[PDB]
């Protein structure tokens, strides 16, 4: 609460400070601020490192094909009212232990999604090797939410990709040391990449009140430098994870 609040201007990729917004601010006010911020001046602006939001990343046709494949696959129970579908290794983060027995491969839609990411930006989202692609489902009735946190950096890489599917939401990012809080409004069919400062310096979260109806987030993760070639864990675990990630599970009826 005792922190500066900023709203993200996608057009200029800068965060503009506001006293109108607050910790408990409603989703509607944040969407309203996102439109109002473009008018506001650059004074107090911060630049987020590695935060990229792509509007209209997925066409309605592309979303529909992916959603039919996702809903055809079974949904698994998760903490925080969320539900999860995982296409990645099972890892004990505490003991640094990885099991690849349950990893049969990446989902079929990954090939289409990855190619599109490279077409927009080979530098920003290209050269991506998938390690875990997890689809997470949030329902307002279940008050689904993800608590504020920074994802593991041991096996997961710098770039974190979330695509909002059935509906959009607001990402809450907190830099506790500098006492700065930013709200990023993620619209329907939007890709958010959190990396660099957002991945480590900032923490990522989605609040329960920012969830309206049902939303599915197509989370994608990449190989950590250690698991990749030139790393200690590549031979023991990484090489298999790269091959298994290359494999594509058939999820579409033709």
Numbering used by the authors: 36 to 289
Authors' own words:
Here, we showed three complex structures of 6mA demethylase C. elegans NMAD-1A, a canonical isoform of NMAD-1 (F09F7.7). NMAD-1, one of the AlkB family members in C. elegans, demethylates the DNA damage modification such as 6mA and 3mC. C. elegans NMAD-1A protein has 291 residues involving an N-terminal extension (NTE), a nucleotide-recognition lid (NRL), a DSBH domain, and the CTD. Like other AlkB family proteins, NMAD-1A requires the binding of the cosubstrate α-KG and ferrous iron for catalysis.
Although we finally obtained the structure of mut3 NMAD-1A1-291 full-length crystals, the ZFD exhibited poorly defined electron density. Here, we illustrate the structural features of NMAD-1A by the mut3 NMAD-1A1-291-Mn2+-α-KG structure mainly. The DSBH, as the catalytic core of NMAD-1A, adopts a typical eight-stranded (β9–β16) jelly-roll fold that contains a major sheet of antiparallel β-strands (β9–β16–β11–β14) and a minor sheet (β10–β15–β12–β13) to sandwich Mn2+ and α-KG ligands at the active center, a large α-helix α3, a small α-helix α4, and two 310 helixes (η1–η2). Additionally, the DSBH is notably wrapped around and stabilized by additional elements from the NTE, NRL, and CTD, with the NTE domain packing on one side and the NRL domain and the CTD on the opposite side. In the NMAD-1A1-291-Mn2+-α-KG complex structure, the Mn2+ ion is in an octahedral geometry and coordinated by NE2 atoms of His-184 and His-239, carboxylate oxygen of Asp-186, and the C1-carboxylate and C2-carbonyl groups of α-KG, respectively. The binding of α-KG is also apparently stabilized by hydrogen bonds with the side chains of Tyr-173, Asp-186, Ser-197, and His-239 and salt bridges involving the side chains of Arg-250 and Arg-256 in the NMAD-1A active center. Notably, the CTD interacts with and further stabilizes the Flip2 region by hydrophobic contacts, including Tyr-272, Leu-276, and Leu-279 of the CTD as well as Pro-124, Val-133, and Phe-138 of the Flip2 region. In addition, the main chains of Ile-282, Val-284, and Leu-286, together with the side chain of Tyr-272 of the CTD, form several hydrogen bonds with the main chains of Met-141, Glu-143, and Val-133 and the side chain of Glu-143 of the Flip2. In addition, SAXS analysis showed that NMAD-1A existed mainly in the form of monomer in solution. Hence, four copies of NMAD-1A found in each asymmetric unit were due to the crystal packing.
